[PDB]
Design a protein around this ligand. Structure first.
Ligand code: BCL
Ligand code: BCL
Ligand code: BCL
Ligand code: BCL
Ligand code: BPH
Ligand code: BPH
Ligand code: UQ7
Ligand code: SPN
Ligand code: OLC
Ligand code: LDA
Ligand code: LDA
Ligand code: LDA
Ligand code: LDA
Ligand code: LDA
Ligand code: LDA
Ligand code: LDA
Ligand code: LDA
Ligand code: CL
Ligand code: FE
Lengths: 281, 240, 300
């Protein structure tokens, strides 16, 4: 079934691979070559998850956990039950994520729109590969990657962070958090501003974008603009994820101590490094 | 059954209702779903259609009620390529001229958008007292080049969003003296030229024209922008 | 292939003094300078700003909060500017010790000053809240902004006011300090048995991640259809154009469902407020109802 306005857009073309061979829809979903690829990787990865559950001895989704190989395996392959399933599932997950992105691109082309969406999605993919591929490889073992389990992968975050004291002191970690908080702040304000204009007080006509601008100049003396706020939100969310991957690719690779020790270059500058008094004096 | 357990169970209930509400609110346009022949589809999904709401539009422009009887209000030059559902519909003629596919446009009101005071939101800079180029390259006077590396015309003016203080169109004078508008988001201002990758130099004349030299309607904007974006798919044969 | 991340040609005109509606034009400042710098990414116009009694009160009250923390930092630094800059991030104005309970009689240097700063901060935030309401009201707009702001105030009220009272001690509040309040956050989790196993904490994280997810989607979506004037969202609501149709169809073809130009902003406002809404709940139950979220978790 279609939306009332959808048919005129359902023309052939825009594919990157296969021509018209996979140029069709299943219900609302557009297929395309990378739609078939996504299904192939996704189905194959899910089977291996169910298989790992059988080896594990449980069907409770809260307990299933696919662990990577032990550190002793280094970067080599492992048997299925001893980290091999994690290795294969990681390949399938990557295949699905990348296929998904290239499918979005095919859809951008058929709709004659820009490619901002798959471009932004690639940052999330990059953060995933930072944690399962780039950082493990640079550290020399797949075991440094995180396990595929609802709860075990939270334990991984907690164990990995406390290996370096309080991870809060990771300076890139601070920046990434700042973009995460600022983004949610910007998202709330933007949604509220449009709704406040499209849904004014009772007994009022719909407001205009000028009202949106005036509201924010009145409030904080500046309005970024209707185009600028969408540029900004895209920026805040991608920068947040960019400094996330950055704050981890350096942990365990070029920095090994407690992240609080990183702030000593400021404290121990040989001129005020000894002035008595204060906290560090 | 401690207070924490009840809090989290309550929240999951509240969240399910919230999602149901959000989804129905997002069915105020494009629903009910249609078959590929325009009739109503048997399976509409589990979420019902929301009840009508009314916006009172400013400047005496009337009221909009959504949901309401939908209508393209224009002919669609396409045809089925399969008896079964889910397959592309092929253009029956020239898709750029017939405004289908990536060249689609919507039958919006044949009026210009207005600012908060009731004046035209978009104006040519020659009619916008005080406006000027403040940074970047001024494209006025520059030649406009198509994807065939041929020159189609030259920039003669900039159409400005006055409330936002933002360039939205280039007015390009064609070899025959007439002008066309070009979306600012589809052009590439360089040092010595303006380059448009979406159209070939001989497709500029096909851009829809406006009926007034000092204002553009929402319908005209949709026809212009749709045509230019459609060139990405439909003008590629002569794209170097 | 232009991407529309930065403006190509800035244009500038007579400053926009804004809508009037029922705003008291006496309290609007003059217009400030235009910023070419900001013009590349957004609007270049600075000002005017509205400055009423709430704004002035919020401003002055907020600066008193600031100066109170400031003098305490200069006092910890022994008034030495060198020591001040060095240990700036390590200074901390801490609440009264548990001994004082909820008493206001803590001497200045043992939590008395933290109480004075919190008072100023309390006045500044709430008067600013009233400001977001009256600014919308003066223009005849909905109060969505003031309600979304409440969600943030909720978590802040819980962290510094509501929870410490239910615990019966101001010492349970957060200290004023760059590093000290990071440390407070770490201890809060260890004391209460790992917040990873607080369900409202996990929810709060889903919505924080989901806010970045949704804004990357929406921001990227609007820029991809800005070639059809998509960022003019209020008129797309009143008169659906091809921008709204292509945006909806991209997501329908991608993941099977879609929003409308208005409805995507209800997703957004809720995605964001649910961060601090769920988080404030989770913090309020920590120590009052549940002592060990991991242990509590293993029974449910
Ligand atoms: C939520 C759990 C913790 C907490 C944990 C963290 C962590 C973890 C980090 C911060 C960071 C910051 N926090 Mg803190 N923070 C909390 C409560 C607060 C409160 C408050 C009103 O209670 C304030 C004013 C701040 C203020 C700040 C800034 C110094 C900084 C960036 C904020 C930001 O993105 O703002 C957006 C607003 C504008 C741009 C305006 N935090 C609570 C107590 N906060 C980050 C930082 O850089 O710390 C050094 C950081 O890494
Ligand atoms: C005790 C634990 C430690 C700690 C240790 C760590 C560690 C260790 C790490 C972080 C990382 C992060 N931490 Mg920290 N951190 C702590 C305290 C905090 C606090 C806080 C208030 O106290 C905050 C706000 C943060 C904030 C953050 C972020 C900056 C970052 C996570 C986002 C990210 O990378 O996304 C990136 C996004 C993704 C990975 C998602 C990718 C999605 C893929 C592409 C698609 C999936 C598709 C899916 C399977 C399909 C399902 C389909 C169905 C239809 C549903 N931390 C404490 C001090 N933190 C992480 C980081 O930076 O990672 C790079 C990280 O590894
Ligand atoms: C980002 C830095 C850390 C990390 C730190 C944390 C912390 C800390 C928390 C989570 C939480 C969650 N994480 Mg994790 N997480 C990471 C990497 C991942 C990846 C991945 C493929 O890289 C995935 C799929 C998940 C998935 C999840 C969910 C189980 C949960 C809510 C996420 C959410 O709503 O996000 C925002 C996205 C959306 C709102 C969109 C919808 C996404 C849905 C919910 C995804 C479901 C995935 C499904 C359970 C797994 C795949 C199913 C396949 C069919 C096999 N995490 C890395 C290692 N994650 C929280 C939790 O409660 O966990 C129990 C939590 O507290
Ligand atoms: C060791 C650390 C602990 C832990 C301890 C805590 C604690 C403690 C808290 C959080 C909280 C949060 N944590 Mg945790 N957290 C951990 C691990 C993580 C991880 C991770 C990757 O593992 C992530 C992603 C997170 C993420 C998060 C967020 C989802 C949440 C904060 C919401 C927010 O927006 O606050 C930011 C918003 C505010 C503080 C509201 C502020 C609003 C006020 C009114 C504004 C003040 C303005 C002021 C005047 C400044 C003016 C500036 C002007 C420019 C002048 N945590 C570990 C396990 N986390 C909070 C929560 O809700 O938990 C359930 C919380 O309190
Ligand atoms: C970079 C900015 C933010 C962002 C952006 C973003 N995400 C995106 C997009 C964008 C712009 C899309 O276009 C795309 C989309 O279509 O979203 C609706 C997407 C997407 N972001 C998603 C999730 C997601 N994004 C996240 C984060 C972020 N996304 C960033 C914060 C997170 C988290 C944890 O924060 C999650 C969970 C999906 C909903 C979707 C991509 C779906 C996809 O790739 O589908 C193909 C794959 C499948 C259908 C299933 C594959 C199954 C695997 C083979 C097996 C599972 C293995 C896995 C490793 C198990 C892990 C489980 C444990 C960790 C619990
Ligand atoms: C929905 C939850 C998110 C959120 C929303 C939010 N914040 C808000 C608002 C909203 C809806 C406002 O209307 C208000 C504002 O005017 O912003 C421009 C504000 C605000 N959020 C602010 C800060 C802030 N918000 C934060 C967080 C969040 N705000 C959440 C992530 C944080 C942190 C630590 O993450 C900070 C530091 C201020 C910029 C502003 C409140 C101004 C104020 O009270 O000033 C008084 C003091 C002086 C003037 C000095
Ligand atoms: C202004 O313009 C905009 C719109 O239009 C007006 C929008 O519509 C949207 C979309 C946003 C929403 C609808 C809001 C809700 C989304 C959320 C909360 C994000 C989180 C999303 C989800 C949890 C959903 C995830 C779903 C999936 C990943 C789909 C599941 C995948 C399946 C079933 C398989 C895919 C199918 C194939 C590969 C083809 C079939 C294969 C064969 C072999 C036949 C945005 C951003 C926007 O700006
Ligand atoms: C040149 O230097 C000078 C001196 C001029 C300066 O100005 C230097 C000053 C600075 C550098 C300022 C530095 C500022 C900070 C470090 C601020 C850091 C703040 C945080 C990390 C956030 C902490 C906020 C959390 C809390 C606990 C907030 C309390 C809010 C409560 C809701 C209020 C509760 C009220 C109470 C207890 C009583 C008051 C009255 C009531 C009616 C409730
Ligand atoms: C730049 C000089 C002045 C200082 C500025 C004060 C500091 C504001 C801080 C954070 C909020 C970020 C605001 C971004 C959210 C805007 C919401 C929105 O939708 O705005 C679009 C547009 O303004 C409507 O037409
Ligand atoms: C789609 C291909 C991209 C590769 C990314 C997948 C990395 C998974 C980890 C490697 C496992 C393979 N092996 C046997 C060498 O360990
Ligand atoms: C890591 C996965 C990569 C797949 C997603 C990449 C999509 C980028 C978008 C294409 C950019 C094309 N363009 C318009 C810049 O020429
Ligand atoms: C026993 C009940 C305990 C409280 C449970 C809280 C769940 C509801 C949270 C949503 C609050 C409603 N609101 C204010 C956002 O509209
Ligand atoms: C606590 C139990 C709640 C069950 C159902 C809750 C549905 C609420 C959904 C929010 C609706 C938003 N609205 C209509 C108030 O704007
Ligand atoms: C992250 C939460 C997402 C909730 C998604 C619920 C909405 C699905 C609606 C599908 C039905 C719509 N349809 C196919 C009839 O158009
Ligand atoms: C505690 C946070 C509450 C969630 C806010 C969601 C916004 C919905 C409220 C609409 C406001 C209606 N009105 C009449 C005041 O304009
Ligand atoms: C407004 C859209 C809301 C999307 C819903 C997101 C649900 C994420 C599920 C997280 C599970 C957290 N929990 C309860 C297991 O701790
Ligand atoms: C936990 C998040 C769940 C998201 C699942 C969304 C499913 C896509 C919408 C399905 C609509 C298609 N259909 C065939 C039912 O009409
Ligand atoms: Cl005021
Ligand atoms: Fe928007």
């Amino acid at each position: 079934a279609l939306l009332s306005f959808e048919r005129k857009y359902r023309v052939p073309g825009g594919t990157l691979v296969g021509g018209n061979l996979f140029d069709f829809w299943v219900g609302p979903f557009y297929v395309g070559f990378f739609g078939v690829a996504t299904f192939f990787f996704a189905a194959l990865g899910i089977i291996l998850i169910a298989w790992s559950a059988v080896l594990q001895g449980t069907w409770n989704p809260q307990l299933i956990s696919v662990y990577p190989p032990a550190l002793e395996y280094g970067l080599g392959g492992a048997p299925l039950a001893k980290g091999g399933l994690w290795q294969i599932i990681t390949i399938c997950a990557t295949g699905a994520f990348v296929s998904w992105a290239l499918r979005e691109v095919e859809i951008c082309r058929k709709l004659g729109i820009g490619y901002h969406i798959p471009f932004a999605f690639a940052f999330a993919i990059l953060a995933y590969l930072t944690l399962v591929l780039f950082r493990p490889v640079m550290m020399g073992a797949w075991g440094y990657a995180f396990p595929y389990g609802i709860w075990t992968h939270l334990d991984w975050v907690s164990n990995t962070g406390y290996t370096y004291g309080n991870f809060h002191y990771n300076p890139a970690h601070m920046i990434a958090i700042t973009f995460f908080f600022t983004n949610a702040l910007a998202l709330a304000l933007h949604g509220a501003l449009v709704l406040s204009a499209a849904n004014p007080e009772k007994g009022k006509e719909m407001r205009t974008p000028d009202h949106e601008d005036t509201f924010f100049r009145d409030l904080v003396g500046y309005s970024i603009g209707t185009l600028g706020i969408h540029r900004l939100g895209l920026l805040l969310s991608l920068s947040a994820v960019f400094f996330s991957a950055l704050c981890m690719i350096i942990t365990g690779t070029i920095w090994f101590d407690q992240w609080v020790d990183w702030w000593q270059w400021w404290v121990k500058l040989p001129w005020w490094a000894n002035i008595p008094g204060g906290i560090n004096g | 059954f401690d207070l924490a357990s009840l809090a989290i169970y309550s929240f999951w209930i509240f969240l399910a209702g919230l999602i149901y509400y959000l989804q129905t609110e997002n069915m105020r346009e494009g629903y009910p779903l249609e078959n590929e022949d325009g009739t109503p589809a048997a399976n509409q999904g589990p979420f019902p259609l929301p009840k009508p709401k009314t916006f009172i539009l400013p400047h005496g422009r009337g009221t909009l009620t959504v949901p309401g009887p939908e209508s393209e209000d224009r002919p669609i030059a396409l045809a089925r390529t399969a008896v079964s559902e889910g397959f592309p519909h092929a253009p029956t003629g020239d898709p750029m001229k017939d405004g289908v596919g990536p060249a689609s446009w919507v039958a919006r009101r044949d009026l210009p958008e207005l600012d908060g005071h009731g004046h035209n939101k978009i104006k040519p800079m020659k009619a916008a007292a005080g406006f000027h180029v403040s940074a970047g390259k001024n494209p006025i006077g520059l030649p406009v080049r198509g994807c065939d590396l041929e020159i189609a015309g030259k920039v003669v003016d900039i159409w400005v969003d006055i409330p936002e203080q933002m360039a939205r169109f280039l007015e390009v004078e064609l070899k025959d003296g007439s002008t066309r508008l070009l979306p600012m988001q589809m052009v590439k201002v360089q040092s010595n030229r303006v380059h448009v990758n979406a159209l070939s130099s001989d497709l500029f004349a096909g851009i829809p024209t406006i009926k007034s030299p000092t204002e553009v309607t929402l319908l005209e904007e949709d026809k212009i922008c749709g045509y230019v974006a459609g060139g990405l798919m439909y003008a590629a044969p002569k794209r170097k | 292939e232009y991407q529309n991340i930065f403006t190509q040609v800035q244009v500038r005109g007579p400053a926009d003094l804004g809508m009037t509606e029922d705003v008291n034009l006496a309290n609007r400042s003059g217009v400030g300078p235009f910023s070419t710098l900001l013009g590349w990414f957004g609007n270049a116009q600075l000002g005017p700003i509205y400055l009423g009694s709430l704004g002035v009160l919020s401003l002055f009250s907020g600066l008193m909060w600031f100066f109170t923390i400031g003098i305490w930092f200069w006092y910890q630094a022994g008034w030495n500017p060198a020591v001040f800059l060095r240990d700036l991030f390590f200074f901390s104005l801490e609440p009264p010790a548990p001994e004082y309970g909820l008493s206001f009689a803590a001497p200045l240097k043992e939590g008395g000053l933290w109480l004075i700063a919190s008072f100023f901060m309390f006045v500044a935030v709430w008067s600013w809240w009233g400001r977001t309401y009256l600014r919308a009201q003066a223009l005849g707009m909905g109060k969505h902004t003031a309600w979304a702001f409440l969600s943030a105030i909720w978590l802040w009220m819980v962290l510094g006011f509501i929870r410490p009272i239910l615990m019966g001690s101001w010492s349970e509040a957060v200290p004023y300090g760059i590093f000290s309040h990071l440390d407070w956050t770490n201890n809060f989790s260890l004391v209460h048995g790992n917040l990873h196993y607080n369900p409202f904490h996990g929810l709060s994280i889903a919505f924080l991640y989901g806010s970045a997810l949704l804004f990357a989607m929406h921001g990227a979506t609007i820029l991809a259809v800005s070639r059809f004037g998509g960022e003019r969202e209020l008129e797309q609501i009143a008169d659906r154009g091809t921008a709204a149709e292509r945006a909806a169809l991209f997501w329908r073809w991608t993941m099977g469902f879609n929003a409308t130009m208005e409805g995507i902003h209800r997703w957004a406002i809720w995605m964001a407020v649910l961060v601090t809404l769920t988080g404030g709940i989770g913090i309020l139950l920590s120590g009052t109802v549940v002592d060990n979220w991991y242990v509590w978790g293993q029974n449910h």
